[PDB]
Design a protein around this ligand. Structure first.
Ligand SMILES: [Mg+2]
Ligand SMILES: [Mg+2]
Ligand code: NA
Lengths: 784, 136, 119, 68, 62
């Protein structure tokens, strides 16, 4: 292996912003790079559209309009005059020519009236749009197969990329729950064998989506696919466009290559649609007659040096994969357990977690991520005792006590550790009917009931509800301990070693650990300075993705937590010589090298899929083993169709007890946010030089005591808003019905208007208790 | 049906008759997390263990008090009006149907004391919504 | 009654099935979901005996009635066809699986002892 | 005329007081529980030895739903 | 945004006008707006119409 592609699994997120660099985002290539960056812009801004107009309006265009201006002035721009002007503007990629001409024909400085009618059209299309998160793919030259350097092209050298994607959501099976919940196992770092062994959340059978399409040949019409190639000899972007059935054009993504050989992959516009308008998407995941523009597929390339030597990047150790996903509505809030953590845990045997060694930097992400869940989840702001205790420590610059492995800090460590749910799922249970066929582990903690009520008194809970307060793969089963989310066994093992004192930490970390933020900034710099860019890029692609619960999830789902789906999954090194930070790994997806041409491109298991098919798939010669040899569409086919339905389904799950409010995937689909309207009512100090200070007139704001002024700020900061109310999801208007299903339906149009969380500064918090960096949810509805 | 009427703009949230049928209330759960002074002689103070409550700065302790005091709960969520459970529908009409049985379980707002508000900004009298769902 | 072809060729796969009234947990409490009754009648008395149970085991559920005539024949009457939800707002929108509901359908074991003149 | 037969159900002779009066298979029932029931000595064979309620417990609840 | 064909007209060389109505297309501005009421559904249009028919006769002599 002389050249490999990185990252091994690229991620691109849908968005209705344009697929151009200045108005798009990039998938992170370095973990934790910009967590406190208060200049981020995840929605297209007025200023961005203005500068894009200006650039298109060179002195070239000025003189042409003057020459035009003298003619019409002879005798409305007629037509042909218009076609000249739009031509020199080079905007017909971003918006349709007709609309450009359209705005120029009603007109009557006339650069400034052209350079103003065009801004209207650009803003009507893109102002406030959810920017696309594109993935850059890189070819690295390897030694021997360690990636050493990015490929550097010279004159005569050329790279040619090939991409083939598909969407099989409409072809696949219902998602009822994760099939591996009943898969016999020895236990991995991701999933204890207790779950299957003690039958804690049995896998359901699942029927076909779109069941009235019969025979394999006809069900092929249910799959959307496309492909393209670009090379370093040509800047031009190439669309990846399919059809459904295979009547509607579906833009699955767009690719472009620059002159250095870097491939940029954009996802689709977030367009989901039914074949008939009256087919509504009333189910969280399984809606027949629907398609969406999600996709995933195979990324390969070929290097041609001028000598004439040609290198194929095509085998699975060297190839790469791409998947597209829903937008990330809080890019700086990390899921407590990520898809990268699933890759790490997949290669571990449960029985051997005894032999794992633990640094404090293996434990800190759990505490850091959970602490930061306060910006997207009420329970982690006001109902989480660990986060309250972290705040306590920070208030006395005592956070470093947590890094102390000696006996006198052990009670402090154990107090925090003991509040976390154990992914053995064997705590806080009683064994019902031991030895009978009704043998069952029943939680004596708080349960999450079914919507199907029974007017029989609930059994009082005797054990406290453990952390985090999130539902999990076994939500379908009232009383199962697997109703609630637990950090996975290998991460719990680190935390348990931490509690016991079996962990190391460097003095350098201690000196940066007076508050959790100071330590988080220090670790971020360790990622910045780490030399292995190839592996950081592999990790960065997945460290923003959810890794549980899987019902089915947000971006990808449960097959990724099995080593079986990788062709390679090896620990390489710690992030720093002295600092592990959960490690860097070389992993690769198990790929079907025939891609769209594979005889298993359209395979299934007949009228249902069940855990038996998964059980059979473990034998690589069986007729079921194709399940793990991915063809395009195989990673995303499990997810909800359309994705918008599942997003609207991915919020709170209320219990009879009001608090804490359980939340599904709040780091990427927030549940409770801090809106722009409140930010504008606490960002200012009483000394601010503004006629309106925090929503009051200057005179009123200066008239109140300093204490009362700071209190009013903290009251506003404390007002959190249901994320579903940040756009019209069916609850707006007199007697509007609101409710669960209307949110599923409306999200298909309203996903692009949901609030986007962005770090913002507070320049002088004074003694208000508001931090210098806050995370503020922007939307048009929540702006004032 | 006597609750909020939402507009396309989030704030302010219009409410019909909130003095007799409240819309956003301060639940007992929050009252129990700001009513105690930091000096209190209890194993749990404002929902924190004695050790944690006493260990943080006074300024932070009073800030946590005011944060709790500021969390207002939709009055419709103070009993099960059909939004409870996995994939519960919720919504306007289910509230109407469930109010026939649940009216007697909705939160009742009652004046309550705060003995030592200190620096916190919380008034000496607060009005707290009591129900079983919101109590803890 | 059933060709082996159906299972062999996977013509209509059996689906998994979750519990009805899933929010009642533990076997002890789930016993409350069962309505049962028992009674005895003999040829020495014409009187009809009701088979009446409770649900949860608040509402009285007449599961049937039994009489024995002087020739020693048992007559068994089913219930009145009364079905009800524990709250009026719980509608039976599903063809088969509706939580919070009971009906007066039943089935059970019929036994007897015959006692002759001599002993 | 399709004949006359002598037939009798398998019965739990303890009826209501049987220790399997309230048996089940946990959070779900699946065919695999039926496959294990075939073995008369397994802890699933009680599926075929009826206690009161076993014949009708399969049916729709309430029956009027299924009829409609 | 939506083109609505309300009808089509032609005239033969003997001066007879023929009027065709539309294609029977009805649609809402958003797919999720269902027409659950018999008569009064907001957000909907259809291609029914009615209007004024006039003509001018021009003879040889002027
Ligand atoms: Mg996020
Ligand atoms: Mg009043
Ligand atoms: Na010590």
């Amino acid at each position: 292996c002389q050249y490999k592609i990185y990252p091994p699994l690229g991620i691109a997120r849908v968005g209705n912003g344009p697929a151009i660099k200045p108005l798009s985002l990039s998938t992170p290539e370095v973990p934790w790079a910009h967590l406190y960056d208060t200049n981020v812009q995840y929605l297209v801004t007025q200023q961005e559209l203005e500068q894009l107009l200006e650039e298109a309006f060179g002195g070239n265009v000025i003189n042409e309009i003057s020459q035009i201006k003298t003619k019409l002035d002879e005798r409305k721009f007629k037509q042909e005059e218009i076609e000249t002007i739009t031509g020199l503007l080079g905007l017909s990629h971003l918006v349709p020519q007709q609309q450009l001409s359209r705005s120029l024909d009603n007109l009557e400085d006339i650069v400034q009236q052209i350079k103003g009618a065009l801004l209207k059209v650009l803003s009507d299309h893109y102002l406030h749009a959810v920017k696309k998160q594109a993935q850059n793919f890189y070819i690295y030259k390897c030694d021997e197969g360690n990636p050493v350097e990015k490929l550097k092209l010279t004159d005569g050298d050329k790279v040619t990329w090939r991409v083939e994607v598909a969407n099989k959501k409409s072809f696949w099976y219902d998602y009822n729950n994760a099939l591996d919940l009943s898969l016999h196992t020895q236990g991995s770092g991701n999933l204890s064998k207790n779950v299957s062994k003690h039958r804690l959340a049995p896998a359901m059978t699942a029927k076909r989506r779109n069941p009235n399409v019969i025979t394999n040949s006809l069900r092929k019409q249910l799959v959307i696919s496309s492909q393209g190639s670009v090379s370093s000899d040509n800047n031009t972007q190439v669309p990846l466009r399919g059809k459904f059935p295979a009547r509607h054009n579906v833009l699955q993504g767009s690719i472009e290559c620059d002159n250095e050989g870097v491939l940029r992959f954009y996802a689709g516009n977030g367009i989901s649609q039914a074949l008939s308008p009256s087919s509504l998407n009333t189910d969280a995941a399984d809606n027949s007659n629907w398609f969406d523009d999600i996709c995933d597929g195979r990324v390969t390339a070929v290097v041609e040096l001028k000598n004439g030597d040609t290198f194929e990047i095509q085998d699975e150790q060297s190839s790469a994969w791409v998947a597209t996903t829903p937008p990330d509505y809080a890019p700086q809030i990390e899921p407590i357990v990520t898809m990268y953590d699933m890759v790490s845990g997949a290669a571990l045997k449960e029985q051997d977690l005894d032999n794992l060694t633990t640094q404090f930097s293996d434990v800190f992400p759990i505490l850091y991520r959970l602490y930061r869940m306060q910006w997207v989840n009420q329970a982690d702001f006001t109902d989480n005792a660990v986060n309250t205790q972290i705040r306590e420590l920070n208030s006395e610059l005592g956070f470093a006590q947590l890094l102390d492995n000696s006996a006198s800090a052990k009670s402090l460590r154990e107090g925090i550790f003991n509040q976390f749910r154990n992914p053995l799922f064997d705590q806080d249970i009683d064994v019902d009917d031991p030895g009978q066929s009704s043998n069952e582990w029943v939680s004596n903690s708080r349960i999450i009931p079914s919507k199907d009520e029974t007017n029989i008194a609930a059994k009082p809970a005797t054990s406290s509800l453990k952390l985090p307060f999130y539902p999990n793969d076994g939500i379908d089963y009232p009383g199962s301990p697997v109703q609630w989310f637990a950090i996975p066994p290998f991460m719990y093992q680190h935390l348990q070693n931490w509690a016991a004192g079996d962990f190391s930490v460097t003095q350098v970390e201690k000196e940066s650990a007076n508050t959790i933020e100071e330590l988080g900034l220090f670790y971020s710099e360790q990622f910045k300075n780490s030399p292995n860019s190839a592996l950081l890029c592999a990790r960065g692609a997945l460290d923003a993705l959810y890794g549980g619960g899987f019902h089915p999830g947000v971006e990808l789902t449960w097959p990724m937590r099995h080593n079986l789906i990788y062709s390679q999954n090896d620990y390489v090194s710690s992030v720093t010589p002295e600092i592990n930070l959960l490690g860097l790994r070389e992993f690769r997806l198990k790929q079907d090298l025939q891609g769209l041409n594979s005889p298993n491109m359209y395979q299934d298991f007949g009228h249902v899929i069940a855990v038996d098919n998964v059980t059979a798939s473990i034998d690589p010669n069986s007729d079921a083993a194709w399940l793990w040899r991915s063809t395009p569409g195989d990673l995303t086919k499990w997810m909800g169709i359309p994705w918008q339905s599942d997003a609207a389904s991915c919020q709170a799950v209320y219990t009879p007890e009001d608090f804490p409010i359980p939340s599904w995937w709040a780091a990427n689909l927030p549940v409770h946010v801090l809106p722009l309207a409140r930010y504008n009512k606490f960002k200012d100090s009483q000394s601010a030089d503004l006629p309106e200070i925090n929503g009051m007139t200057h005179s009123i704001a200066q008239g109140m005591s300093e204490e009362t002024f700071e209190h009013l700020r903290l009251e506003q900061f404390s007002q959190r808003l249901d994320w579903l109310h940040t756009a019209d999801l069916g609850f707006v208007g007199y007697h509007a019905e609101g409710g669960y299903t209307n949110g599923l339906i409306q999200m298909v149009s309203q996903w692009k208007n949901m609030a986007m969380v962005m770090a913002r500064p507070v320049e002088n918090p004074g003694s208000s208790g508001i931090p210098n960096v806050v995370y503020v949810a922007y939307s048009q509805a929540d702006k004032d």
